[PDB]
Amino acid sequence: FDTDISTMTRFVMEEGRKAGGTGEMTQLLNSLCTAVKAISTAVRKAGIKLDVLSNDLVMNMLKSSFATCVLVSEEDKNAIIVEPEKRGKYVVCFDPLDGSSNIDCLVSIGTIFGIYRKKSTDEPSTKDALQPGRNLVAAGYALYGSATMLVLAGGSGVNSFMLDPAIGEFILVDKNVKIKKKGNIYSLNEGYAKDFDPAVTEYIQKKKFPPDNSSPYGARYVGSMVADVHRTLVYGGIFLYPANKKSPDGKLRLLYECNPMAFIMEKAGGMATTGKEAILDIVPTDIHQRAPVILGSPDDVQEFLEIYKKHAVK
Amino acid sequence: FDTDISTMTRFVMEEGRKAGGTGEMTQLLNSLCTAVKAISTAVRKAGIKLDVLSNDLVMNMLKSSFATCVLVSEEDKNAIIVEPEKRGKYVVCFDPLDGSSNIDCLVSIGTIFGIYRKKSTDEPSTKDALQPGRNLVAAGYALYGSATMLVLAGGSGVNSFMLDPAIGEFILVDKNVKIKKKGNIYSLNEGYAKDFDPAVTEYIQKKKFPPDNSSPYGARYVGSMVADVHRTLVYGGIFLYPANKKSPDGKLRLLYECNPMAFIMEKAGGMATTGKEAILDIVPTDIHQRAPVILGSPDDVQEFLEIYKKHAVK
Amino acid sequence: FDTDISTMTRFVMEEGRKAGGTGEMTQLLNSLCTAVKAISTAVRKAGIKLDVLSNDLVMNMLKSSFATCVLVSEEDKNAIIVEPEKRGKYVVCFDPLDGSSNIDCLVSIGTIFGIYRKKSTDEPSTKDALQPGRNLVAAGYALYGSATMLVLAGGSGVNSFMLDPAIGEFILVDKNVKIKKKGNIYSLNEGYAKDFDPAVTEYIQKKKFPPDNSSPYGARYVGSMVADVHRTLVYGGIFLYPANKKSPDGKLRLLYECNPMAFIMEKAGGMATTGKEAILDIVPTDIHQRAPVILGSPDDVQEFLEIYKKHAVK
Amino acid sequence: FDTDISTMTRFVMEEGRKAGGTGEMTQLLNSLCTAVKAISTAVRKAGIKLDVLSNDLVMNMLKSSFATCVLVSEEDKNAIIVEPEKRGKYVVCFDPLDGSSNIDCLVSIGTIFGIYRKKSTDEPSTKDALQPGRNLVAAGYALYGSATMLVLAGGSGVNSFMLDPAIGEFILVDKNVKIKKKGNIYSLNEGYAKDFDPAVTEYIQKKKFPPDNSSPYGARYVGSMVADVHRTLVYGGIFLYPANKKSPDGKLRLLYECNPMAFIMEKAGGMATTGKEAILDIVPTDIHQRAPVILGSPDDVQEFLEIYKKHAVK
Ligand SMILES: [Mg+2]
Ligand SMILES: [Mg+2]
Ligand SMILES: [Mg+2]
Ligand SMILES: [Mg+2]
């Protein structure tokens, strides 16, 4: 066995010692890890709804952290104001179990969260949760796959942690990851080819028949956001979830879905945009607001952006 | 805890009692399950090559089963003749760790196997492994995902088993599964759109702009065969791995990749073909021979087949 | 000869003048009658496939009616969208030649159709054909027997028309028919006695050994749906096509087989159910969907229903 | 002046060309518009009863349309059977001049109508007017305010038309309107606070002191149904007319008041319910039957519904 275990806690603990945290973020992240480990377990045996189980699990651990004041979940109509006695300084937006639809086919589902520091001195309210993604102080997700992973983006980089099931701790596996500058994979559901705007139809076209005669990009789309975004972070490329008829503003939620993934992308060196603007700069008006997202290696989203404006004729 | 555990072993044991097996198949399948459980473990922590580890693991457990005589692996140039003392009546073709390429992105990789009964009275040789897929007596795969699954197709149906990590046994989860008649998902790497033959280009086209004005099929492609084939078995639809420039005969291997998946499809009520002929009817000439594969719900591969012949102009 | 001929056309023409039709239904029904008359002829001499001939015949006459937009046939994998120029407001579901299997033994085969008014303002699609039977505006069948009959159920009753071969017109023969309240004949293939659920086994039993010591019902089963359903409408009784092993959801199709016959039954004063629910209330998900059917005189299907629930133990 | 005028007639004329109408609906709607324009005029100068004038006006224009057979007015004890010579296929329910009580204070009063297609082949009778709101083929109202508006809900959406007094035509102003998902205004006469059931008292309470500390909803109640419902459709929010002591079943009439407004709400993307059930699903027993109504943005009536059942303890 190893005598010096590099656990996530040790890591967030060092990090917090720089800025001089009170340690709340550590309580927050520890509580979160407990919820994630419980979910990985439910998932690894749920066969021999989980959605509500996961929501409650994450909600309860978060509250017991004494580190939060406002909880916004994909699973809740309204924002949650944490009791005064368990109150703390952070606002956390989360999607307890994402990809919960195609869950049977074992397609890598996951948990997504974004953490903001409350700014107003007054009583907590939904307003605290309506901050632009650029205001996030931490963000990440857990991918429940062959192994349970937790990717975390602090204000100093992206680090990948893998759950060691023998001791139930997330061990640092990759430190300060950077997304490659240009990738060879594009990802999106081409089954909606019929509703795609001309910009996307053109961009895709340039992928299958490159004009400089290079090898065309390969296609890859899992169907679960956390899965597609993770492959993107890891091997590079681009991920697209534009608007169509069935979802004229995109299908992915802004607060607890696009923002946390946008923040991780930038910290990783990638980019995240709506075509018009960067996801992190969008100021939210509603906690369940959606947004179109194009994200990935910088050289590919930029190439996308040119084609976007060539058609914006602004 | 449950007092009556429905383990895979109990199941293959009942099944074997019908035909009146000597019990070799049970030894074979038990040895296999041990190898799979060891691999799920290596995988769940391989981060904090596996290919060769897995090959050796599966090879060794198979030999110790006293149930086999000829082993054909994706990882081996030639077929393996099992020692006389450990010799048994079955020939097993396998792919120890498939999807071993995009393994980092947690995209559901797996193990694939096909089991044949030796027919010739003479000394074992490669010839024993060169039988048409229709001659298989058992087949299945293990999907290493959120949970480790083992799908098995005996001569009586397809059953899904999920690994209970607490006791290390595969518990029967789904009995005699049937693939839906028609699905709404199509799966293939459209990044090779440029090399696709007219039949596929047309079929795909009919998917994105249905002529009867129905809703178009959704796209889904994980990149790992076992993953894509499993989602197909589960939610229905179609999976396509045709030939192109880089692979003019298809990329998937016949013996230990297409055949086992073709056999499971048929037993599930689906179909598996090359366009010209059914995968199970192809008589192999080489153990590493490849084949183009179209497989899935019957109503979709048939629809594909019409378009195939409309272009075959035979 | 008669100076005042009571033809079907005159009849649908009067009827249409009530509701104030544009006359499309008349064009539709006239085109249909032409197809039926051509088929009766092919049949009356087919000896000295017809299926495909009949499908094309009915398809072509329907399109030329300028009264339809979506055609669903038993003979077609998908629904048919009628050309814009020949487009009209109705959706018609049909089974061109039913009983086409035991056709040699002269056992009364026939054509079945159901007519729906399109509801959506948008482009025609399969969805227009997926309406519950209770939405039918007209329905009927043609029985090709000793005489060619056409039974039609408008929203005002059931009328029987017989083809006068001398002038090639269907003359009204029976106006507003009503099925008797209770009949003395039961109809179903008892050769599947082995797969029958306990409810049916009990019901049949009460038929051969009536508990009130009355005379037992006679048995009658032609093998051709249109034939059995017609004898039922005429002399009363009950017709049963439940589910078994070979057909766990029933063998008869919902859209163009059970629905049109269910609608006629109700309009005739009879009932049509699956055991659980009335056939007309089932909302279709697929154009080739099947359904178990019990239909006939009200006093008999009700008696059946009691025994059904006595075993449902819901 | 504009060379291409987008009049309501042109619009209902295009729409009718889809379904293939005989043109009756156009005659119907044109006759209606004439009655509305005459009323807007009487109203714009009635100062320098109107109720009976309006009833007669609408009754006469409707009859001259040759498009109706049964007329049900708020102003008439019984239903009206239209003469055979002027008879047509539609049944129209209407409230000629609503809000006719607080008319002096200039509070936006209006005309409300609902149109049904007759179904029975027999002689017209009151029964034709007793169909559930979900059976409506068209519905709308005219708001006589700063401008005269006509809101129409066809089976394809809601469109707002404004009367151009210079040429006396209703010009399309807003196409296919959608009610916002959640609004910030609640509307009801709180002066009956004393008779309100606990569900409403609680819901209102959650509006003035939001539990998630958000800004409380503003109050707005004009006193005239058409006015309150129109502001609701336009800016979103919720409208409530529950039952009390003075009106234990609600005050608004079902046929020509709640149904037409319920149909418009749904077509607009909103909802309309009694607390127990949706207004459109209520099958009428009497032409002057009343119903409690809660209607508006979906996110608000749903929030209401939860509180309704939390108190139904069903
Ligand atoms: Mg989600
Ligand atoms: Mg392989
Ligand atoms: Mg048939
Ligand atoms: Mg009124």
What lies within 8 Å, CB to CB, of A197 at 6+ separation is: A242, A243, A311
- For the residues of A186-220, what is the DSSP string, one character each? EE--GGGTTT--HHHHHHHHHHHS-TT--PPPEE-
In this structure, are residues D113 and D36 in contact, taking their beta carbons and an 8 Å threshold?
no
For residues C237 and C218, give the distance between their C-alpha atoms in angstroms, rounded to a whole number.
10
Q: How many C-beta atoms lie closer than 10 Å to residue D23's C-beta?
A: 13
Type of residue found at A292 = P
C99's tokens: 């009983």
- Which residue type sits at A120? S
Chains D and B touch (3+ CB pairs under 8 A): no
| Residue pair D217/D223 in contact by the 8 Å Cβ criterion | no
* Extents of the domains making up chain A: 2-176, 177-311
- Tell me how close the Cα of C134 comes to any Cα of chain D, in angstroms: 13
Is B145–A147 a contact, with Cβ atoms under 8 angstroms apart? no
How far, in Å, CA of B209 to CA of B212, rounded?
A: 9
Residue type (1 letter), C251: K
Listed in sequence order, the residues at least 6 apart from C299 whose beta carbon sits closer than 8 Å to its beta carbon are C181, C182
Distance CA B75, CA B82 (A): 16
* Token code pair at residue D27: 């005659």
Amino acid code (one letter) for C3: T
Residue whose C-alpha is closest to residue C271's, from C289, C294, C290: C294
Helix (H, G, I), strand (E, B) or coil at B87: strand
- Resolution in A, one decimal? 2.3
B29/B33 Cα distance (integer angstroms): 6
Which of B132, B253, B126, B232 is closest to B188 using CA atoms? B232
A79, A72 Cβ separation under 8 angstroms: yes
Separation between Cα atoms, residue A59 and residue A195, nearest integer Å: 37
Q: How many C-beta atoms lie closer than 10 Å to residue B137's C-beta?
A: 16
E strand or H helix at B1, and its extent? none
| Residue B13: strand, helix, or coil | helix
Tokens of D121: 């082949």
Q: Are the CB atoms for D190 and D204 separated by under 8 Å?
A: yes
Q: Is A263 helix (H, G, I), strand (E, B) or coil?
A: helix
DSSP string, D37-88: HHHHHHHHHTT--HHHHHHHHHHHHHHHTT-EEEEEETT-SS-EEPPGGGB-
**What b/e sequence results for D150-189 when a residue is b if at least 16 CB atoms lie within 10 Å of its CB, and e otherwise?**
bbbbbeebbbbbbbbeeeebbbbbeeebebbebbbbbbbe
Strands lying side by side in the sheet with A238-241: A218-219, A185-187, A238-241, A293-296, A271-273
Q: What angle do CA A31, A40, A255 make, to 5 degrees?
A: 60
CA A29 to the chain's CA centroid: 15
Report the alpha-carbon distance of residue D116 to residue D124 in Å, rounded: 13
Tokens at A58, concatenated: 């994450």
The token pair at C199 is: 């409810």
Q: Binding residue per annotation — A241?
A: yes
**Residue C112 backbone dihedrals phi, psi, to 5 degrees:** -125, 140
Contact, D9 vs D26, CB < 8 A?
A: yes
Asked if A227 and B144 come within 8 Å (Cβ–Cβ), the reply is no
In this structure, which amino acid lies at residue C232?
A: T
Q: Select from B89, B87, B83, B112 the least CA-distant residue to B100.
A: B112
**B146 DSSP assignment:** S
Per-residue CA distances from B108 to B149, B177, B226 (Å): 11, 21, 7
| Interchain proximity B214–C123, CB inside 8 Å | no
- Cβ neighbors of B61 (< 8 A, separation 6 or more) are B31, B32, B34, B35
Fill in the DSSP letter of residue A20: T
Query: If you search the block for the tokens 């340039």, which residue do you land on?
Result: A206
- Beta strand C109-117 with C87-98 is antiparallel
Structure tokens at B11: 């199941």
Query: Which residues touch B252 (CB under 8 Å, ≥6 apart)?
Result: B225, B241, B258, B290, B291, B293
| A220 annotated ligand binder | yes
Q: What is the CA radius of gyration of chain D?
A: 19
* D84-to-A250, C219, D29, D69, D117 alpha-carbon distances in Å: 55, 52, 20, 8, 17
Question: D16 and D26 in contact (C-beta within 8 Å)?
Answer: yes
Tell me which DSSP letter residue B237 carries. -
Closest C-alpha among C116, C10, C17 to residue D88: C17
Residue length of chain C = 314
Nearest to A191 by CA among B220, D9, B19: B220
**Phi, psi for A191 (deg, rounded to 5):** -70, -10
3-state SS class at B41: helix
Distance CA C68, CA C54 (A): 18
Distances (CA, A) of D290 to C174, D232, D239, D282: 45, 21, 16, 11
Do the Cβ atoms of B72 and B94 come closer than 8 Å? yes
By C-alpha distance, which of A192, A256, A181, A186 is closest to A226? A256
The rounded Cα A157 to chain-centroid distance in angstroms is 14
Residue C14 touches partner D, C-beta closer than 8 Å: no
Which amino acid is present at A38?
A
**Rounded to an integer, what distance in angstroms lies between the CA atom of residue C102 and that of residue C100?**
6
DSSP codes of every residue in D242-299: ---SS-TT-SSBIIIIIHHHHHHHHHHT-EEE-SSSBGGGPPPSSTT-B--EEEE-HH
Contact C20, D88 (CB under 8 A): yes
Contact D102, D223 (CB under 8 A): yes
Contact between C81 and C69 (Cβ < 8 Å) = yes
Q: Which of D69, D77, D117, D75 is nearest to D94 (CA)?
A: D75
| CB of D95 closer than 8 Å to CB of D111 | yes
Strand, coil or helix: A261? helix
Show residues of chain A in contact with B144, CB under 8 Å.
146
Topology (CATH level 3) of domain C2-176: Fructose-1,6-Bisphosphatase; Chain A, domain 1 (3.30.540)
CB distance from D303 to chain A under 8 Å? yes
CA B78 to chain centre: 21
Compute φ and ψ for A66, nearest 5 degrees.
55, 25
Asked if D299 has any chain A CB less than 8 Å from its own CB, the reply is yes
The CA distance from C34 to C24, in Å, is 16
Output the CA–CA distances (angstroms, integers) from residue A309 to A249, B63, D57, in the order listed. 18, 63, 57
Amino acid at position C48, single letter: I
Quick check: B107 and A231 in contact, CB under 8 A? yes
Dist CA B288 CA B281 (whole Å) = 17
How far is the centre of ligand 2, averaged over its atoms, from the C-alpha of B110 (Å)?
Answer: 9
Closest-CA residue of C relative to D17 is C121
Q: Where are the alpha helices (DSSP H) in chain B?
A: 8-19, 24-45, 50-64, 198-208, 225-235, 259-268, 298-310
* CATH class as words, domain B177-311: alpha beta
CA gap C142, C108 in Å, rounded: 10
DSSP A215-260: PPPEE-B-S-HHHHHHHHHHH--EEEE---SS-TT-SSBIIIIIHH
Inspect the interface and report whether the beta carbons of D214 and A125 lie closer than 8 Å: yes
Q: How far apart are CA B210 and CA B33, in angstroms?
A: 44
Instruction: Pull the structure tokens for residue D178.
Output: 């959608």
Long-range own/partner contacts, residues A158-163 (CB < 8 A, 24 or more apart)? A158/A233, A158/A264, A158/A267, A158/A268, A159/A11, A161/A8, A161/A11, A162/B45, A162/B47, A162/B48, A163/A36, A163/A37, A163/A40
Per-residue tokens: D96:
């000629």
Number of Cβ atoms within 10 Å of the Cβ of D233: 28
Helix (H) or strand (E) holding B101: none
State the distance from the centre of ligand 1 to the C-alpha of A100, rounded, in angstroms: 8
- Tell me which method was used to determine the 3D structure: X-ray
Shortest Cα distance from B52 to chain A (angstroms)?
18
Whole-number Å distance between alpha carbons of B137 and B135: 6
- The separation between CA C263 and the C-alpha centre of its own chain, rounded to angstroms, equals 8
- DSSP category for residue B111: E
Q: Which two tokens stand for residue A72?
A: 């916004």
Q: Which chains contact D through at least 3 pairs of Cβ atoms less than 8 Å apart?
A: A, C
CA separation for the pair A94, A72 (Å, rounded): 6
Amino acid identity at B75: E
Interface of C with D in 179-238 (CB under 8 A): none
Contact C179, C299 (CB under 8 A): no
Distance CA A146, CA C124 (A): 46
CA distance A162 to B51: 20
Query: Which region holds residue C106: left if phi is over 0, alpha if psi is between -120 and 50, else beta?
Result: left
The Cβ-side half-sphere exposure at C28, using a 13 Å CA radius, reads 29
* Touch between C and B (at least 3 CB pairs under 8 Å): yes
H, E, C per residue of chain C: CCCCCCEHHHHHHHHHHHHCCCCHHHHHHHHHHHHHHHHHHHHHHCCCCHHHHHHHHHHHHHHHCCCEEEEEECCCCCCEECCHHHEEEEEEEEEEEECCCCHHHCCCEEEEEEEEECCCCCCCCHHHHCCCHHHEEEEEEEEECCCEEEEEEECCEEEEEEEECCCCEEEEEECCCCCCCCCCEEECCHHHCCCCCHHHHHHHHHHHCCCCCCCCCEECCCCCHHHHHHHHHHHCCEEEECCCCCCCCCCCEHHHHHHHHHHHHHHHCCEEECCCCEHHHCCCCCCCCECCEEEECHHHHHHHHHHHHHCCCC
What is the C-alpha separation between B11 and C304, in angstroms, rounded?
40
* Full 3-state SS string of A79-118: CEECCHHHEEEEEEEEEEEECCCCHHHCCCEEEEEEEEEC
Residue B31: Cβ-neighbour burial (10 angstroms; 0-12, 13-18, 19+): buried
Q: Which of B51, B56, B93, B52 is nearest to B73 (CA)?
A: B93
Q: How far is C123 from chain B (nearest CA, A)?
A: 8
Report how far ligand 1's centroid is from the alpha carbon of A224 (Å): 9
Question: Which residue reads 């609004």 in tokens?
Answer: D183
A105, B231 Cβ separation under 8 angstroms: yes
Contact call for residues D7 and D169 (beta carbons, < 8 A): yes
With 0-12 / 13-18 / 19 or more C-beta atoms within 10 angstroms meaning exposed / middle / buried, residue D86 is: middle
Structure tokens, C159: 């009328």
* Residue type at B143 in one-letter notation: L
| D124 in C contact zone (CB under 8 Å) | no
Nearest by Cα to D290 from D244, D246, D258, D245: D258
The shortest C-alpha distance from A290 to chain D (Å) reads 13
Task: Measure the CA–CA gap between B137 and D37, rounded to whole angstroms.
Answer: 82
Length of chain B: 314
Residue D104 backbone class (left: φ over 0; alpha: ψ -120 to 50; beta: rest): alpha
In angstroms, what CA-CA distances link D238 with A164, B261, D110, D212, D265? 52, 56, 20, 19, 11
Determine if residue A275 is left, alpha or beta; phi over 0 gives left, psi from -120 to 50 gives alpha, anything else beta. left
Q: What is the DSSP letter of B215?
A: P
